[PDB]
């Protein structure tokens, strides 16, 4: 009885922390989504800057 | 005190009439399988105590 | 600390409700302008004989229909996302208040 | 704490997105409406000439 | 006479102020091959008559 | 864990309600083309009147 | 009042429906 | 039509009675032992 419930309450607390863990994982999904969203702007800015800088340094005698 | 909390947060729902502020979207919770026991089981635990 | 967080959750949930009502009145506002192109086309298609003309207003009316349908579908998309955000916020509210108790 | 704050930022940015889209694309709608009206006017003028 | 019928039709359509009578949700009107000609041809028929 | 008649009863009735709303909106989503057909009919009859 | 006055004018001399629908 | 909903109600009722019966069996076996 006491041990039977001591098993059950531990199990349900583990289930609760599992729901916690899934919530954390979807948080991480959202965060990596943000990071990859901004990475595109990063790459675009970097490539445009590199191209034009190469051009202007090479050119204009 | 366990069943005191029972009766309190039970009565603040039946007596709590539907119109309120908590009305806001949730998801389907049909998958909920929290419960484990039976009426006869509460009855018999109470008998054990007495 | 937790009580402060509870209060600001309440603020944000009804802010999300305000967003939803903005979206629905946007739906109502965009409902009417669909009438423009469709009614003009329906009444214009009727002419007695050959003077029927393919012309810039007709092309622009087709563009009207296309663009307005795009408007409606994007707006109902926004509707789905706003409901999803609200339900997530509400479950967060529920969990936070239970550990408050 | 992190759950709360992340959710808030998510919701706020989404709201901003929605408002911008609705406003600008409404402006586009009425602009092309004006264009349609002008074109119809010139067509009427030509017809009267004939 | 035919082109006068045309002018009157175009008048009560463009000069029609909406929100009043034609607010029925017409649909399926996104296709119409009623136009058989191109305005240049119409102009040259008129010139032929002259 | 409140496992008595209410939980299952509520779980079922919410389903019943949403299944209900399904066909209730089915009626209206048909009422639209019900409107459209009479729209075409009225447009025709006024044109033959002309 | 508008409708009654219009009816009286019609009697003596010898869409609005959508607006009334919205009022209803 | 309505037979659909009545059948689903009988389905759920039969389910619930089955869990009731099986757990009561397990319990009565516990006191039996």
From Swiss-Prot, chain F:
Disruption phenotype: Male mice are fertile but show lower fraction of motile sperm cells due to a significant proportion of cells with deformed flagella. Belongs to the tektin family. Ubiquitinated, leading to its degradation. Deubiquitinated by USP16, promoting its stability. It comes from Mus musculus. The chain holds residues 407 to 456 of 557 of the full protein. It comes from the Eukaryota. This is Tektin-5. Disulfide bonds: none annotated. Strongly expressed in germ cells of the testis (at protein level). Expressed in spermatozoa. Also detected in brain. It is found in: Cytoplasm, Cytoskeleton, Flagellum axoneme. Sperm-specific microtubule inner protein (MIP) part of the dynein-decorated doublet microtubules (DMTs) in flagellar axoneme. Forms an extensive interaction network in different conformations that reinforces the helix bundle composed by other tektin proteins (TEKT1 to TEKT4) and MIPs to anchor the tektin bundle onto the tubulin wall of A-tubule of the sperm flagellum. Microtubule inner protein component of sperm flagellar doublet microtubules. Interacts with TEKT3.
Swiss-Prot record, chain G:
It is found in: Cytoplasm, Cytoskeleton, Flagellum axoneme. Strongly expressed in germ cells of the testis (at protein level). Expressed in spermatozoa. Also detected in brain. It comes from the Eukaryota. Ubiquitinated, leading to its degradation. Deubiquitinated by USP16, promoting its stability. Disruption phenotype: Male mice are fertile but show lower fraction of motile sperm cells due to a significant proportion of cells with deformed flagella. Sperm-specific microtubule inner protein (MIP) part of the dynein-decorated doublet microtubules (DMTs) in flagellar axoneme. Forms an extensive interaction network in different conformations that reinforces the helix bundle composed by other tektin proteins (TEKT1 to TEKT4) and MIPs to anchor the tektin bundle onto the tubulin wall of A-tubule of the sperm flagellum. Microtubule inner protein component of sperm flagellar doublet microtubules. Interacts with TEKT3. Belongs to the tektin family. This is Tektin-5. It comes from Mus musculus. The chain holds residues 255 to 304 of 557 of the full protein.
